[model samples]
Target: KIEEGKLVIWINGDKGYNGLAEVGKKFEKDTGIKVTVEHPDKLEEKFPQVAATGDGPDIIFWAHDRFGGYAQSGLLAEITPDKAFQDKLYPFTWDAVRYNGKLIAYPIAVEALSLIYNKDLLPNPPKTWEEIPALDKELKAKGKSALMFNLQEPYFTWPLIAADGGYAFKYENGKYDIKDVGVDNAGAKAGLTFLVDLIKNKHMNADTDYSIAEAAFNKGETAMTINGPWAWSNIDTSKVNYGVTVLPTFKGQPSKPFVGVLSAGINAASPNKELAKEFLENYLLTDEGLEAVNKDKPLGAVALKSYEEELAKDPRIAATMENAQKGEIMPNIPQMSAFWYAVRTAVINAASGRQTVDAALAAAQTNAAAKCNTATCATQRLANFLVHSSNNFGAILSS
Candidate 1:
């Protein structure tokens, strides 16, 4: 016998649930199925545990990166989106939900970093790294830095590092070779050196973190910052005349930031799998449903092409959406836990002058390799996932 009349969804926080709740009300009114949206504590830990026992929410709403682990552990149901529905989404959105050739989730939104500049300070944003030195000299005369971001955070720094073909792991045949650590590659070293030079030349502060960079940009004390749509809430309130665009090229290669997706997946253990799927397909994936959720949470970028026209009205979202197209999907494998720790430490060491860029990246590569030498070890490292939130952003590390 199949269960019916109810469905449950586990979302990460309270802010995004209000819109989903309204959608749920409509779902209930239409199909006589009561939908409940929940904000559970420690969802990353609790979801895996509860789902393993065949007792968790019928659907899980979270970042796409977690799908690899969930699908591998038999926690997620394989979804087959029809070709017509599939065609409506951005091509890159599939990278987030596909594991071992199986579709594990439906992407709801996308996000990536871009160059955000204060138009009053920088009439024209630099299009290449070479242009920055001249701009920095001008900004320095006015008591401001040329650009600032979370210097030690890999999430913010990856674009520069990846501009010259650096990557965290070797992805091939739809899988990540965790043992193939690439943080110490020549491309990565070149990128880190750029940052080190910025600090040594006094063009950027080595002490800057997410909060420091964000505060400075909002106060109009800094001319530019590398950030995503998530930072716009604070930026909008600051009343600064800001413009968003793709990051300047490093050397001759374009910056490639990590693209993250927000997704919804059905629980493999749910008795109401059909109902859960119905709720998502008939409601959540619809234009009306996405707009409702976006109204409350303000999605950084809509994954569905149909909604792009309306959201693109906001130039910030439009630019970020454009940058996301050039980005590599953040690898969703559990091995990413070690990559985060290693890269962040390496960036901090190099930027703070505690170690040379080459030394720092080499040490990081060794550190990550030791922790994730094989698929089994990588899965074991999942415990370290989201160990702590990075300030107010609520853990963009795994986002």
Candidate 2:
């Protein structure tokens, strides 16, 4: 039982805090309970330490990918929202909050990468990766490159792996089996091989990192690019007539991007559990509470159905929602931290000819497997696999 008159929370950025502050004001005034929200720069690293010390904020606002690890460490409280409230959210979003069958957080927003194309350069976007080379061949003289994305980041490379039927881990029966890692599976190798050929053929190379691709797309030097909705704001609309859609098909499969859901979690050790829970149930998840938070920022995809419908009037927002509907949730196990670096090295090595495709992927498989094979890592990974999958958007209006 929470006997405190104040509730404290740690959130990701100034943007998030701004919304929370306004909504929190309402919560404080109506219930006579003060609310505090702090913006943390190193949220992921800091959260664990703060949580273990038992001085952590009642709630932590951030992405869903890291929630499982926290839940597994017994740092999060399992919230059981009524079925009425549960039905208010999209089915997939629940997958992010449920760790070992316990709800660990509230799903806040949804995001996914999509194909951002220049309408002037290509009236019709290519339907598959195989079509890119031919599209570029003809468009080369017209000052267009078929596609470009951040090659330096493994996050961007993930859709490629999925396109070829690969996954970080096999999720089934509400669990993620770490031994089922597909980083170097045949599917993954096929996807990487295709990308390597493109790099070697100079369609896209190691030198074409994020900035270069971002610049090229914004300046209208590229016909289309793989990017998220956030990139929409940066496009020079005066110079580039752009459109958005799901990633093109690859090897007869959907080029599935990772679905990123921002969420809010309750700390298990917080002294204000009941108050925090009440605030979350009666205010934070309510329509008015969501509106208050979205008043200025207007998140692109939201968890509430009504709120999402309101935001989806914008096609860009709709694109994110549509693509995310077809994407997969990234596993949130702590071992995933190690998995990222290993995969990045593999992508670089294969692209630069530092290693053969088989060797590059084999090295990645080995490096990442070591981190998750331990009993501790396996326990956490298994717990998160149970949360293996799973928002609304609102921020636009306030801006």
The residue-by-residue lDDT of candidate 1 on 5-27, one tens digit each, is 57888987623688899999999
- Superposed model 2: Cα runs more than 4 Å off: 1-42, 53-58, 82-84, 134-144, 205-216, 219-221, 234-240, 269-284, 288-300, 312-314, 332-335, 352-354, 370-399
Question: Model 1: runs farther than 4 Å from truth?
Answer: 1-59, 80-92, 130-134, 171-176, 267-275, 312-318, 352-354, 370-399
Candidate 2 lDDT over 159-192, as tens digits, reads 8787878778666664556666788898899999
lDDT for position 45 in model 1: 67
TM-score of each: 0.76, 0.76
- Alpha-carbon local distance difference test for all models: 0.78, 0.75
Q: Model 2 Cα displacement at 180 (Å)?
A: 1.9
For model 1, state the Cα shift of residue 57 in Å. 6.0
